[PDB]
Amino acid sequence: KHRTSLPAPMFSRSDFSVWTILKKCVGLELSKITMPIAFNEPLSFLQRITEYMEHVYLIHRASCQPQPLERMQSVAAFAVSAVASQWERTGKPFNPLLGETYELIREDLGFRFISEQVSHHPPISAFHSEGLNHDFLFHGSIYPKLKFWGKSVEAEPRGTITLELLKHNEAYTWTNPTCCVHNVIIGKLWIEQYGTVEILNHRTGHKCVLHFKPCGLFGKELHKVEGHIQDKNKKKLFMIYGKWTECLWGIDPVSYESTVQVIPGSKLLWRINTRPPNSAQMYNFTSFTVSLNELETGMEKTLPPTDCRLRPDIRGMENGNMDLASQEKERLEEKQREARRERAKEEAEWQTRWFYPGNNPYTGTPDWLYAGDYFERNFSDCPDIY
Amino acid sequence: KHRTSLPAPMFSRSDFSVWTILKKCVGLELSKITMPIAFNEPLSFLQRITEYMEHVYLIHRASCQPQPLERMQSVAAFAVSAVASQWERTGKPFNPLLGETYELIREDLGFRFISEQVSHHPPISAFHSEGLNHDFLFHGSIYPKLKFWGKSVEAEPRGTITLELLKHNEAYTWTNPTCCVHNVIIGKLWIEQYGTVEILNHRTGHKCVLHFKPCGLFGKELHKVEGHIQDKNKKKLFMIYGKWTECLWGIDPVSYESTVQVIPGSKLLWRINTRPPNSAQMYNFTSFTVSLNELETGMEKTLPPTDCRLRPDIRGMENGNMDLASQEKERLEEKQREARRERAKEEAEWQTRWFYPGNNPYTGTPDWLYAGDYFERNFSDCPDIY
Amino acid sequence: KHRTSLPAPMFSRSDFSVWTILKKCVGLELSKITMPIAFNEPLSFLQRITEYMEHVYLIHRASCQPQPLERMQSVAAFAVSAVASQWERTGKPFNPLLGETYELIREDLGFRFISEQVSHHPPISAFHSEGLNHDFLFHGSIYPKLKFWGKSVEAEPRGTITLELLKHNEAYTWTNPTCCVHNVIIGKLWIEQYGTVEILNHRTGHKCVLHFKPCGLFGKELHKVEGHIQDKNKKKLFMIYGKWTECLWGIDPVSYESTVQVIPGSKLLWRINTRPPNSAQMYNFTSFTVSLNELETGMEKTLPPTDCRLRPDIRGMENGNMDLASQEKERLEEKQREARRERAKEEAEWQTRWFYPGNNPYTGTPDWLYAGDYFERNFSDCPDIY
Amino acid sequence: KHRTSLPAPMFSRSDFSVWTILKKCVGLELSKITMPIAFNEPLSFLQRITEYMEHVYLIHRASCQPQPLERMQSVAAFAVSAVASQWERTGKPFNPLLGETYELIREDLGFRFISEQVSHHPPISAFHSEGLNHDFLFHGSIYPKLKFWGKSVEAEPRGTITLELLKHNEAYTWTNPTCCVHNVIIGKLWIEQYGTVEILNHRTGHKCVLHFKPCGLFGKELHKVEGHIQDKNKKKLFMIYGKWTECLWGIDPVSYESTVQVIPGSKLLWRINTRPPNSAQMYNFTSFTVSLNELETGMEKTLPPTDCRLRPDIRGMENGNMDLASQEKERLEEKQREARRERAKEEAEWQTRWFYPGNNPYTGTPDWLYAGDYFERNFSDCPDIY
Numbered sequence A, B, C, D: 001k002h003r004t005s006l007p008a009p010m011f012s013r014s015d016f017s018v019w020t021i022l023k024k025c026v027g028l029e030l031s032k033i034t035m036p037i038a039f040n041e042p043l044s045f046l047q048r049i050t051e052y053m054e055h056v057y058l059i060h061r062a063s064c065q066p067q068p069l070e071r072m073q074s075v076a077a078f079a080v081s082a083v084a085s086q087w088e089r090t091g092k093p094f095n096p097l098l099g100e101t102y103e104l105i106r107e108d109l110g111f112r113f114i115s116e117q118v119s120h121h122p123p124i125s126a127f128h129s130e131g132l133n134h135d136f137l138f139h140g141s142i143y144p145k146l147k148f149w150g151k152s153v154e155a156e157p158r159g160t161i162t163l164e165l166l167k168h169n170e171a172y173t174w175t176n177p178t179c180c181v182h183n184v185i186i187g188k189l190w191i192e193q194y195g196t197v198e199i200l201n202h203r204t205g206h207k208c209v210l211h212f213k214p215c216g217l218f219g220k221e222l223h224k225v226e227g228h229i230q231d232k233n234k235k236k237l238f239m240i241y242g243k244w245t246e247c248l249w250g251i252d253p254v255s256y257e258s259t260v261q262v263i264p265g266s267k268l269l270w271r272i273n274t275r276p277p278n279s280a281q282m283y284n285f286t287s288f289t290v291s292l293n294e295l296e297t298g299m300e301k302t303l304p305p306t307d308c309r310l311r312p313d314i315r316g317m318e319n320g321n322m323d324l325a326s327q328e329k330e331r332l333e334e335k336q337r338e339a340r341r342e343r344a345k346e347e348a349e350w351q352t353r354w355f356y357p358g359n360n361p362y363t364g365t366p367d368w369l370y371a372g373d374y375f376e377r378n379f380s381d382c383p384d385i386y
C-alpha cells in the first residue's frame, strides 16, 4: 500500500554540524567563531543609545506645549529622530562588557544620562536620562536581537522606551523599529528601517501609530514613514508622513482628503540635522557622536571605573591601532569569561550596580528600572572589568 | 569644548564586506554561497506542509461535534499536532523550485491535497486540502523566514492557516509558532518551538490562545503548551495545557482553581503518535512522511510534470547517491536561474498555474487562494522545471 | 642622492601569519590543520612500500642470470616496476604511527617482508625483505617528503634502496624518482613520475642511469623512461627505453644507431601487469594490494601488537565507515601525541624495536639497518600504539 | 587464499578535489585562489635579484687579486653575501609581470644592471650586470620554485649564476642555496638557508664547495657555513667557515688541524653590513634595498615603459595604500591573462625584448643570455604591461 522505509539508509548516520563538517571534510578544526573587529565602530552600544538625546530639543519642545495633541507631535518627531542617525552607519557598535557603564552630562542641552550594561547573555542595556530642569524622565532597556540570513542582517532593538513628561504628569511608551543592513556578503552596505511603532499617552489615551515602510518592489517606498495620531476613541486627529532620512510632516485629516511631496497647510514636525563634512571619514558619525567617547579635562576624578571612555579596545580603534585594539578586545573578553567561571564555582549571581529588575509601571512588561543615586558617585564596590 | 574629529582616520576607507575580506586578506575569491545538501532531508517543503494532514482525524472529529466549544478543542488539538512532527527533525526540506507542485489523495483519510510553490523570491508555498466527504476546507500559504544567529537557526512559518468546517458554516484562522534549531555550529542538533498562536472562530467569536513556551533558565519549560478558549466576550470557557511533544489536556476553569501533571477531571485533546522503530534511520520521518514521496503504481499517467515525486535531486538523496543528487540540485537551480533571465529579457512576469493572489476573506490579509480545477488534470501549459 | 626611507610606514607593524589573519580578519580561530581522511586510502605507508615486492619475480630472474649485464637489466626492470603501481593511484596512504609495523610472508613468491615506522618527525619507514631460498636481500628506508604548490603535490621518497644478490656476492643501490599529483585543487587527479635514477653495482662498477621524463609542453613525453647501462669505464653497453605505465625495452648500442615505438631486435625487460576489473571500485588497488591488509586465518597468534592489520582506522575505512574511521584516527593520533609528552617529561628517548640507526655499508649514507630476529616473534616489550 | 576485493565499496565513487569538497560539504564555491597582498613587500623579484650587487666591492676585490686562490676567496665571499639580505626578510617580493624589466646604474659602485621577466609559466627572471670599468660580467637566470608543507615554505632559486672576471679571462658558475620560511601558519616568521653551493673556476679547475648547514636538533647549526677551496686535482688549499648572517673566515689546511669561534691566523673574507635603525619599520630592507624602487629626478626620459619603478601596485603598497594596491595588482594580472588569450587566438608566441634562450657557454645548461643593446634605449616595440 504505502511504503514503510526509504530505499537506502542515511548517507551519514552521524551527528554532524558545522564544526564537525569543517573538521572531517576540510582540515580545519575550530575553537572560536567571533565577530572580527573590522565590522565594528569606535563606539559602545551604551553610547549608541545615548544618540537618542541628540534631538532632546524635541522633548523640550513637547514639554512646553499646552495641549496633548501638539505634545504627541513632538514625541512622535523625537522617536523618529532617534533612528535617523543609522543612515549610512554600517559599523557595529562594540558589544559592551557586563558591568560596563556610560554617563553623559550636558548642561547646555538640559539632561544628564546614565546607562549600564545590565546583562550579557542575552546582552541587555539599561539607560536612564532626566532633564536638568525637572521637565522629563527618559529611560528604558534595549535587547538588540541580531538576526542574519541571505544578504542582510536584521537588528531588532527589543525593549520598551519610556518618556515621562513631568510638568504634564503623563508618560509615553513605544518600541523602536527593526534595522536592516543589506549587502553584508557582497555589494555596498546600506541601511533600512521598517516596522510599526505605537506611542501611547498613558493618561490621555492618545496613541500615535507610525509605519516605517520597507522599500517595496524596486524600492519606491524607501525610508517612507506614514502614520496618524488618534485619540482615546480611535478618532484620527492628525496625519503624519515623510521620511526618517529627511523630514517629518503633519496635517489635519480634513486637508488630507482635500522626494517627499509636501501638502499645502502642513507643518514641519522634524528635519534631520546635516552631517559634518568629515562624517564619511569618521565612521559616518554625527557631530553629537564624536563627543560621546571624549575624555573631558579633569574627568579622571568623577568617572566610575566602568565608564567605556576608559575602555581600551574602543580607544585603540579610535586611535587607529587595530593591532592592539583587537588584542585588547580579546583580552577583555577572556577576562569576562574568566570572571564568569569564578562567579559560577562560588554559586554567586552577578549584581547590577545601578539598575534593578522590575516591571514597567505603565505596561507591566518586565523592564530594568533606574535605582537612583548614581550621581552621588559612591564608586567603591564597582566591578573590575578593564 | 567638544571635539569635532577622531584622532586617526578610519583604518580602511574602503567599502568592505565578507566577499571583499576573503579576497584581500585570505586568497579565496567566492562566486556562490549556498546551502550544502548534507543539511537537507529527502523531502520537499511542499511535502513538509502535507504533514499537517497526518492528524486529519482531529478535523473529522471537530466536524462531528455539536457545539462550538468542543470543536475548538479539536481545532486547537489539530493545530498543535501539526507542529509535533518537528521533534528531532533537524534536516531541512528542499527549497522547492518555482512552479513545483505536490498532490496527495488519501481516500482512507478523507482528503485530497494540492500544493504549489507559488514564488521563489521570497519562497512562498500555497496549499489547499478539501475533505472527500464535503466536510472541511483546509488551505493557506507559508513563507518560511529562516533567521540565524549564534548557535541557533529560527524558522518562522509566516502565513495564515485557514480551516473551514463546511457542515457548521464557520471558519478558523491562526498562525504557526516559530521553530528553533539549536547547536547548529557545535553540539547536538535539537528542536524547540515557541510563540503565541491565536485561533479565531469567525462566526461565533470563539478565540483559542496557545502559548508555546520557550525553555527558560535551565530548560524547565521545555515544549510546554498552555492556553485557554475564550468566548466572544473574553470569558474563559476552557483551560488547555500539556506538551506538543506528548499530549494536550483540557479542563474547565472551575476545576483549574480547585512530566505533564494531569489534573483529575481533565480530558485528552490529543496525544502524539509513536514513531516507527526505523525512524532515526530514516531522517526521523514519521510513518506518514515516508508515504509522501512514493511514486504509486500507475501514477505516471495522472501526475503533472511539476510534481516533486518526479524531482530527481530529492529522489537521488532518497536512494543514497549524494554525488548526483548534489549535481542534479545544482543543475535544477541553474536551469531555474536561466529561466528567470529569459523571462526578464522578454519583460514577462511568471504565471502561477493553480493559485492566484488575493485577500483572505476572513482577515483581509493578503493570501494565496486556490483557483480550483486542479484535479480535472489539464496539464498542458505547465512549466518545464525538471 | 638615494632615499633612506619609505614614504609610509608598514601597513601592519604586527607579526602576522595565517592563523593570525584568520583570527583578526575573519571570525575563525583555528586549533588544528590536519589531513582529512577523504584523501586517504585503506593502506598504511608501510604496506605501500610492500608493493615493491609485487614484481619480485624480476629479482628471482636477476638472481639466475650468469653475467652482470643481464642482471642489471632485470634489476633496472624491477626498480621501474616498483613505481608502476602509482598509475591512477591518487589516494594517500595513511601516515603510520610511531612503532607501527607490517609483516608479509609469501612462500609462493619466495620472500618474507618486515617494515617498521621508525620515526614520526620526520616520518621514516624502514623495510627489510629476504628471499626464502637464500637468494636476495632487499632493504632500505623511506622518508616521503611531501611538497605542495599550485595545482600539484610532489612526493619525493628520499632514502637509499638496497638490493643484495646473495648467490652473486654483489649489491645494488638506487633512489626512487619523485611522484607528482596534479589537479589537487580543481580538475581530475592524475599521477606523474619524473627524476633521474642511478643503480650502482658495487662489485662490478656497473651503473644503470634511468631518466623518468616529465611531460613536456603539451605532454608529449608523458611517462617515457629512457636510459642506459654503462660499465666501469663509462662505456655504454645497453640502451633502455619505454614507459613505466606500459613496458620497458632494451637494445644494444649498435642497433640503436642503426605509443612506444619498439625497435626490431629489442628484447622486453618488463611489462606492467593488467589490473583487475574491480580496480577503479577499489581505490585503484592492484591484485597484490588487496592482499596486504588481509587478516589471515589464525593470524591472531603470530602477529605482533603493532601490525597495521590490527590498526582500526584503516580497517574502518576499509569497511566503509568513515564516521568511526575518522574518530579512530583522531583517537590514535592524540594517543601518540600523549605518549610523546610522557616520554618527554621523563627525558626518555623512543626506542626502535626492529631497526637501528647506522650507515649503509655500500654508500656510507646514514640508513636504517635491519637488526634481525624479528621472526622469532619475541613480542613482549612492544609498544602499545592502538 | 588471498582476498580479491574490499568489504565495502569506496565511500565516494566521485572525482573529488579541494574545490569539489568546498562546494559540496561547505557552501563555498571558489573561482580563484591567489596570493594575498599582505604577505608581499614593496619590491619586485627583479629588484630582489639586484640585491646581489650590494656587495659588488667583493667582485672589485676579486678582480684585483693576482692569483686564482685569493680570487676564489672573494668570489665565495660574494656568493655568500648575496643571500645575507634574506635574514629577517619574510615578505615575498611581487611576482613580476611578463615583460617586466628593471635597470639600475650605479656609477659610484661601478656597474650597470638590467633584468627582464622573461617568462611567467614558469616565472623566470633573467639578469645581466657588467662592470663600468671593463672588469666583470655578472649574469644568470632565476626560476624561484616555491614549495610549501607543514609550517614552512621552501624557495629554491633554480638557475645558474655566472661571474666572468674580464681582466683575468676566467669565469665562475654556481647555484644559490634553498631559502626556508618557518612558522608561516602560526608563530614568528623566521628565515633559514641550507644546501650545497659549488663555485667552479672554468679555466683553472678551482672549485669552492660551500655547505649551508640546516639547523639540526634544537638548532645548534643555525646559519653555519663550512666549506673549502680545492684545486684541479681535489687538493684542498683553503678552509672556509662562519655564518652567512655574520662573517665568513678562511684558513689554510695546516693551521686547521693545528658564536663563531675564530681560529688564530684566519683572515676575514666577508662581514655583513649593519642594517639601518629604521629597517624593521621598512619591511626589513637594507640601505641598498630602499634605493631600488626610487624614481630618480629626470628618470621619466630614460626608462622603458616596462620598468617596475612605473609599476603601480608596488608603488601603492610603498605609499601605504593597500586598498588600491590590491586592486591595481588584480587589474594588472587580469590584463596579463587577457593579453595571453589574444596571443593564443592569433597563435603567436611571446617575444622577449632583451634576453634570448640559449645555452650557457660554460656548463651547457639551458640559460637566458643577454642580447646586448639595452642601454641604447630603443624603447619602441616594448610591451604594454601597466
Ligand SMILES: CCCCC/C=C/C/C=C/C/C=C/C/C=C/CCCC(=O)O[C@@H](COC(=O)CCCCCCCCCCCCCCCCC)COP(=O)(O)O[C@@H]1[C@H](O)[C@H](O)[C@H](OP(=O)(O)O)[C@@H](OP(=O)(O)O)[C@H]1O
Residues within 6 Å of the ligand: A018, A148, A149, A150, A151, A185, B018, B032, B033, B034, B035, B036, B039, B089, B090, B091, B092, B093, B148, B153, B155, B181, B184, B185, B333, B337, D026, D027
Ligand atoms: C546574495 C547572498 C547569497 C549568499 C548567502 C550568504 C550566506 C552567509 C555567508 C556566511 C559566510 C560563509 C558561509 C560559511 C557557513 C557554511 C554554511 C553555508 C550555509 C549557506 O551559505 O547560507 C545560506 C544563506 O543563509 C545563511 O545565512 C545561512 C546561515 C547558516 C549558518 C550555519 C548554520 C548551519 C547551516 C545551515 C543550517 C541548517 C539548519 C536548517 C534547519 C531548518 C529547518 C528545520 C545560502 O542561502 P540559501 O540557502 O537561501 O541559498 C540561496 C539559494 O540557493 C537560492 O536558490 C538563491 O538562488 P537564486 O536567487 O539564484 O534563485 C541563492 O542566491 P545567490 O546565492 O545566487 O545569491 C542563495 O541566496
Ligand SMILES: CCCCC/C=C/C/C=C/C/C=C/C/C=C/CCCC(=O)O[C@@H](COC(=O)CCCCCCCCCCCCCCCCC)COP(=O)(O)O[C@@H]1[C@H](O)[C@H](O)[C@H](OP(=O)(O)O)[C@@H](OP(=O)(O)O)[C@H]1O
Residues within 6 Å of the ligand: A018, A032, A033, A034, A035, A036, A039, A089, A090, A091, A092, A093, A148, A153, A155, A181, A184, A185, A333, A337, B018, B148, B149, B150, B151, B185, C026, C027
Ligand atoms: C556558540 C556559538 C558561537 C559561534 C557563533 C557562530 C557564528 C556563525 C558561524 C558561521 C560559519 C563560519 C563563519 C564565517 C563568517 C565570517 C563572519 C564571522 C561573524 C561571526 O562568526 O559570527 C557571530 C554569530 O552571529 C552570526 O551568525 C553572525 C552572522 C554574520 C554573517 C556574515 C555577515 C557579516 C558579518 C558581521 C555583520 C556586520 C553587520 C552588523 C551591523 C549591525 C548594526 C548596524 C559571532 O557571535 P557574536 O558576535 O555574538 O560573538 C559571540 C561574542 O563574542 C560573545 O562575547 C560570546 O562570548 P561569551 O559567551 O564567551 O561570553 C561568544 O561566545 P562563544 O563563541 O564562546 O560561544 C560568541 O557567541
Ligand SMILES: CCCCC/C=C/C/C=C/C/C=C/C/C=C/CCCC(=O)O[C@@H](COC(=O)CCCCCCCCCCCCCCCCC)COP(=O)(O)O[C@@H]1[C@H](O)[C@H](O)[C@H](OP(=O)(O)O)[C@@H](OP(=O)(O)O)[C@H]1O
Residues within 6 Å of the ligand: B026, B027, C018, C148, C149, C150, C151, C185, D018, D032, D033, D034, D035, D036, D039, D089, D090, D091, D092, D093, D148, D153, D155, D181, D184, D185, D333, D337
Ligand atoms: C590552478 C591552481 C591555482 C590555485 C593555487 C592553489 C593554492 C592552494 C589552495 C589551498 C587551499 C585554500 C587556501 C587557503 C590558504 C590561504 C593562503 C593563500 C595562498 C595562495 O592560495 O596559494 C598560492 C599557490 O601556492 C600555494 O600552495 C601556497 C601555499 C601557502 C600556504 C600558506 C603559507 C602562507 C601563505 C603564503 C606564504 C608566504 C611566504 C612567502 C615568502 C617566500 C619568500 C621569502 C597562489 O598561487 P600563486 O601565488 O602562485 O598564484 C597564482 C598567481 O596569481 C598567478 O598569477 C596565476 O596567474 P595566471 O596563470 O592567471 O597567469 C594564478 O593562476 P590561477 O589561480 O588562475 O590558476 C595562480 O596560480
Ligand SMILES: CCCCC/C=C/C/C=C/C/C=C/C/C=C/CCCC(=O)O[C@@H](COC(=O)CCCCCCCCCCCCCCCCC)COP(=O)(O)O[C@@H]1[C@H](O)[C@H](O)[C@H](OP(=O)(O)O)[C@@H](OP(=O)(O)O)[C@H]1O
Residues within 6 Å of the ligand: A026, A027, C018, C032, C033, C034, C035, C036, C039, C089, C090, C091, C092, C093, C148, C153, C155, C181, C184, C185, C333, C337, D018, D148, D149, D150, D151, D185
Ligand atoms: C604546525 C603546522 C601544522 C599545520 C599544517 C599547515 C597546513 C597548511 C595550511 C593551509 C591553510 C588552510 C588549509 C586549507 C586546505 C585544506 C587541505 C588540508 C590539508 C592539511 O592541512 O595540510 C597538512 C600540511 O601540509 C600541507 O601543506 C598540505 C597542502 C595540501 C593543499 C591542498 C592539496 C590537497 C590536500 C591533500 C593532498 C592530497 C594528495 C596526496 C597524495 C600523495 C600520495 C599519492 C596537514 O599536515 P599533515 O598532513 O602533515 O598533518 C600533520 C599530521 O597530522 C601529524 O600527525 C602532526 O602530528 P603531530 O606532530 O601532532 O604528531 C600534525 O601536527 P600539528 O598539526 O599538531 O602541528 C600536522 O602537522
